[PDB]
Design a binder for this molecule. Structure first.
Ligand SMILES: [Mg+2]
Ligand SMILES: [Mg+2]
Lengths: 209, 35
């Protein structure tokens, strides 16, 4: 008959961690059996590598028989360049796509190191847009620093390189007119392209049947 | 150079050119379609 000898207790809010992932970290280590002597700090520096979604690992031991591991995961705000994530402060990490993956998370895009930059804009435009009835599905910065936002609809907004808060300002002012014209013709606004002092060019599309 | 994007960025901003099919709205003060 089986019953435990070394116990393992995990604490803190955890969405992306399976309990087995920590177990597999300690066990897949060296000299398995030196289990509450293998340095409490070495076990931090092992949970951290094997899991890039842990912000922090807090390991102590409680004599006689248990190992108490406190975890803080990275809370992502966006899906960066399709294959990473990012949290409020700009930190980029990853997860298995085997994991939740049916998340209502926006997706940011941009050059290699620009995940904090893109986050900046994503906050500043998502803010003003949510001040009206609009949420950001995507937001893509190019190398040249030209922003293109896909919206809650599949309405893309090409804001170019310049007066961006002025330009999606101008879109919010216009949206009613666009919706009116959108039905009196029975087409959906595909994009509105704002690279104009004072102007906007709208491309329309047919609509799902 | 910028290629096809910096060319298009310019044509819109400096010339107010559009693409085939797009409706244009200017805001010399108020919104206004081609009409
Ligand atoms: Mg900005
Ligand atoms: Mg521009």
């Amino acid at each position: 008959q089986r019953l435990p000898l070394s116990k393992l207790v995990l604490t803190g809010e955890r969405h992306y961690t399976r309990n087995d992932d920590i177990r597999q970290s300690i066990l897949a280590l060296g000299e398995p059996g030196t289990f509450m002597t293998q340095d409490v700090n070495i076990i931090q520096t092992q949970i951290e590598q094997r899991l890039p979604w842990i912000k922090q690992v807090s390991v102590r031991k409680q004599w006689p028989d248990e190992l108490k591991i406190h975890l803080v995961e990275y809370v992502p705000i966006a899906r960066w360049n399709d294959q990473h994530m990012v949290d409020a402060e700009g930190n980029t990490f990853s997860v298995p796509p085997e994991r939740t993956s049916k998340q209502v998370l926006p997706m940011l895009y941009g050059p290699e190191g620009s995940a904090n930059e893109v986050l900046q804009g994503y906050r500043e435009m998502g803010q003003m847009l949510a001040k009206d009835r609009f949420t950001l599905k995507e937001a893509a910065m190019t190398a040249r620093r030209s922003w293109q936002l896909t919206l809650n609809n599949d309405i893309k907004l090409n804001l170019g390189r310049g007066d961006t808060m002025k330009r999606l300002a101008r879109f919010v002012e216009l949206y009613p007119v666009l919706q009116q014209q959108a039905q009196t013709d029975g087409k959906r606004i595909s994009y509105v392209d704002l690279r104009y002092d004072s102007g906007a060019a709208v491309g329309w599309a047919p609509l799902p049947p | 150079n910028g290629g096809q994007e910096a060319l298009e960025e310019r044509a819109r901003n400096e010339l107010s050119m559009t693409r085939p099919g797009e409706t244009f709205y200017r805001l010399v003060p108020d919104a206004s379609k081609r009409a």
